Amino acid sequence: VSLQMVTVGHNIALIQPGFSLMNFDGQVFFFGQKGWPKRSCPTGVFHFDIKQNHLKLKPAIFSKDSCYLPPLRYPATCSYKKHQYIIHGGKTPNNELSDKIYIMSVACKNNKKVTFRCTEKDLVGDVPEPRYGHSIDVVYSRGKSMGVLFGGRSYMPSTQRTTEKWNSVADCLPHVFLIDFEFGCATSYILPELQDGLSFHVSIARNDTVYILGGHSLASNIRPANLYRIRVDLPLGTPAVNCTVLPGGISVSSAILTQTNNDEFVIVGGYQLENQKRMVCSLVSLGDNTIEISEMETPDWTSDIKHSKIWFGSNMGNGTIFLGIPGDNSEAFYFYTLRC
Amino acid sequence: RGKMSSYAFFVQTCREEHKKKHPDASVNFSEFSKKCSERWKAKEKGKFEDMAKADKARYEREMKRPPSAFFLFCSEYRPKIKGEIGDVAKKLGEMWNNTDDKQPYEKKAAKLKEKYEK
């Protein structure tokens, strides 16, 4: 666990809280630029590579058959196995929520320059209302694959929305969503175990189970220390989901998550209280029917991170985390990598 | 206070004499000043002359919107009390304090409040 300062290039102003990194074969890429795309990079997607602690963000182009998805802050992102990425929800630069879902896959990789295919996936049934700060994962049960989508926030509904509180948000109803990408349909499941709304939580998916960690419940304004197990059964008939509550969970919202090794991940970052960042780190070890959360050695944080009121970041995919804090005002943010 | 000359003491004693001689009668000022001036115009005056210094010593020691509901109620109960200003007000206030009672007077004031505003 080594912390390291990162220099940034001329277009550092793109990086904002709510950005996304995607991993395609050890090459990292960047999505969710601040502002609408400019002529320097019309897709708003960037090859994101740190060479000797220097980050150069370099524009990437789309295939002829691609959509031009708007930059999205706090979307639900997810990796799918033939490798492709799922993006659902998010805020647009105009502060609208997209109900849309986009698929990011590589189209071409000649001369170590990458062309992406961004295709829009239509969705019918019980489509989840437009959201941000929510999780989406794919599971595997009896040789069948299914997408799970939980929690998040949206604006009030048209019936009750007032220009005077036009930007007020509220946690979506905690229904678990099963989303089949092959058929383009979506089924909602209300569970008595999930009564509270929850967003900015951590989602770990192994086999046919998804773990819901931490997060913030807006109605109660509490960051739960609970853990929730959701297992999806995929038989020939109706798929069913069972929710189990497991004591000994983390209390943290907005935390990041990287996979260090098979069956283990690290949790870092995030907030314990509105004005108390979570400086501790957790190790998660996954058994077939067991999950183990254990304290691990804190990193050698600097006096900037310690006293920063906020921080943000994301997993880069190799067990390293790209971390940003608001800096001086010049360069608005200060960026660090954190290896494991 | 004031300090009085010999001629002034003279005029005062003449006014006292005239009052005792003629009680029912009202004196004219201009004529009385004339006749006092002629009577004053060497021994008679010595008494007043010595009285003036005693008065000088005396001068030394002297040197060293329509109305409130209470107002509406007050005005009506005023006639009865008169039959029975400061004492009136005290009685009015004590009885108004001892009294749903003042709801009608305040309804009248409520009607008058819009009339004052416009």
Binding site: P17, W36, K64, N167, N275 | -
Partner: protein, 618 residues
């Protein structure tokens, strides 16, 4: 004992002095004036005063003999306070001193003026919308609202770096309308219409928005805000009534660019170029505004309910901000115009023959085309097909021209031609940067000598106003050797000055009819001059505003009747008010500076308050 002066003496002493003349005056009264000593002395004194040219004391004595209670109604104190720029703290100093020295409460204390303000601010008068506005609240007592409109600020969400206060849009309009009520009544009268007539009035609102720099942050606890501001404002431009098969103009703003009548609607400490924060704050304004298009305001004026329908014209925007909010590319792009689809190379070849095709509704279609890419095109081809609309618009603006910034840009171009004419670039193609610096230095010095202009870093309205004259071309010609080019500069400037009044005056049809008639003809020869005798600069390229000025002025004028009256110059002058008020009319604290400025800037724009200051000119 030398006689003392008469005025020093005691009442007794002056009686003895005037005893001789007292009786002498008494005879004259009984003889000539019925024994009225009071009135014959009052008149003798008054006449003695005016004999000594001392009319003030005579006039004051006259008001004492009558029962003259001199005091100013509070709303009149408000008007004097607001419009003379006195602060409450200074006005309280004035009030206090007047009352102490005169002994009379001529000016009202602040608690009264503070109560007088209530009528003039949003949320006082009642109103109703038929049908009810969508997503807007039927409450009618809503004054200053938090401009973040409930934007999520928990440490998980996006960071909130701005502070903002606003009026609800409808609620603001009502207060504006009620402020204009006397002037709407008078306008009907002067059109020979029933005062009580209540028909469907139509209100045309001019909409302006503006970014400022150099707004220093205060010390003290709060959000670390940026040193920039954005201001959204509206101006009521004209009101007509429908009386038969006619639209009768009952109000038209006389000074359509005056800070007096640009009303503030939203102040925020934010960067206009921070799209996320700009749309978070203003989205509730454009929602309120959209709802008002589909409804009729019924509001009570003079006892009689009146209906009002509203037309919103967003024209107080400079080109940079138009492009940001209508999803267009930035002004360097090859798509040079916000009004047409022409390319900057085509604008230099054709020059004049283009018509207005862009619109808020087209741009929304085009974004969606951009986003969806329905012909599965290459980026080049996709961009060509949507003509540079690669972002989703979020504000409806009129396709127009801002006369202030147009005026400024054109002058800045002429200033560059003057430089290049001095270096004889028409004859010598290449020249070093040092060689170019000196061209500017010559021109800068000469403009100081012959025009009294000092040099400035960035071009000004007044600089533009003073540079674009034929006296200035005379000055510049002294520096250019070739008189074949004195002729070209003189003509180019003559054409320009035949053109300018069209896009600047309030009614070109009434004010420069021959200028309006000849525009298409004159703009052709202007364009031909640039292609012929200025080929060195205008071959393959032209500026945005030259294009707008040359190709769209006549159409805009017939669609709208004016260009100048819809300019941003009024909203810009409001910025000057922003700065003054932030210093000297608000609480010096981070969490009240915006609402105090908003409230007091609204007052400063009240026509009801302004009228008390034209009372001398009855």
């Amino acid at each position: 004992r030398p006689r003392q002066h008469l005025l020093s003496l005691t009442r007794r002493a002056q009686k003895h002095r005037l005893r001789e003349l007292k009786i002498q005056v008494k005879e004259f009264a009984d003889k000539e004036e019925g024994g009225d000593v009071k009135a014959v002395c009052l008149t003798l004194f008054l006449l003695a005063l005016r004999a000594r040219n001392e009319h003030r004391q005579a006039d004051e004595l006259e008001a004492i003999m009558q029962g003259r209670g001199s005091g100013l109604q509070p709303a009149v104190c408000l008007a004097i306070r607001v419009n003379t720029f006195l602060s409450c703290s200074q006005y309280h100093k004035m009030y206090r001193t007047v009352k102490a020295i005169t002994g009379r409460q001529i000016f009202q204390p602040l608690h009264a003026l503070r109560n007088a303000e209530k009528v003039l601010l949003p949320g006082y008068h009642p109103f109703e919308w038929q049908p009810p506005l969508k997503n807007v609240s039927s409450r009618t007592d809503v004054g200053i609202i938090d401009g973040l409109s409930g934007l999520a600020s928990s440490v998980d969400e996006y960071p909130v770096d701005t502070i903002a206060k606003r009026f609800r849009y409808d609620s603001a309009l009502v207060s504006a309308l009620m402020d204009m009520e006397e002037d709407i009544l008078e306008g009907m009268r002067s059109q020979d219409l029933d005062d009580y007539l209540n028909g469907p009035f139509t209100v045309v609102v001019k909409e302006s928005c503006d970014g400022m720099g150099d707004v220093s942050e205060k010390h003290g606890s709060g959000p670390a805000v940026p040193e920039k501001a954005v201001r959204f404002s509206f101006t009521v431009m004209r009101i007509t009534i429908e009386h038969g098969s006619q639209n009768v103009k009952v109000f038209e703003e006389p000074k359509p660019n005056s800070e007096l009548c640009c009303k503030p609607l939203c102040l925020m400490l934010a960067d206009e170029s921070d799209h996320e924060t700009l749309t978070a704050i203003l989205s509730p304004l454009i929602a309120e505004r959209e709802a008002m298009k589909s409804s009729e305001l019924t509001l009570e004026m003079g006892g009689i309910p009146r209906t009002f329908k509203f037309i919103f014209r967003g024209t107080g925007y400079d080109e940079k901000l138009v492009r940001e909010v209508e999803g267009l590319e930035a002004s360097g792009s090859v798509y040079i115009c916000t009004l047409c689809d022409t390319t900057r190379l085509e604008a230099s070849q054709n020059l004049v023959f283009h018509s207005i095709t862009r619109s808020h509704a087209e741009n929304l279609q085009r974004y969606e085309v951009w986003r969806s890419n329905p012909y599965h095109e290459s980026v080049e081809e996709l961009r060509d097909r949507v003509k540079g609309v690669s972002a989703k618009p979020f504000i409806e603006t009129v396709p127009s021209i801002d006369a202030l910034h147009c005026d400024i840009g054109n002058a800045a171009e002429f200033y560059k031609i003057f430089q290049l004419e001095i270096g004889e670039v028409y004859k010598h193609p290449n020249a070093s940067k040092e060689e170019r610096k000196r061209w500017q230095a010559t021109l800068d010095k000469h403009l100081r000598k012959r025009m009294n202009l000092k040099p400035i870093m960035r071009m000004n309205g007044n600089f533009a106003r003073k540079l674009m004259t034929q006296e200035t071309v005379d000055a510049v010609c002294e520096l250019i050797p070739s008189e074949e080019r004195h002729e070209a500069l003189r003509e180019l400037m003559d054409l320009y000055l035949k053109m300018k009044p069209v896009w600047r005056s309030s009614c070109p049809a009434k004010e420069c009819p021959e200028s309006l008639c000849q525009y298409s003809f004159n703009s052709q020869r202007f364009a031909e001059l640039l292609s012929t005798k200025f080929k060195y600069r205008y071959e393959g390229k032209i500026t945005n505003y030259f294009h707008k000025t040359l190709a769209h002025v006549p159409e805009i004028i017939e669609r709208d009747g004016s260009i100048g009256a819809w300019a941003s110059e009024g909203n810009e002058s409001g910025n000057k008010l922003f700065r003054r008020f932030r210093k000297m009319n608000a609480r010096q604290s981070k969490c009240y500076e915006m609402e105090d400025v908003l409230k007091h800037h609204w007052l400063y724009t009240s026509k009801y308050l302004q009228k008390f200051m034209n009372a001398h000119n009855a």
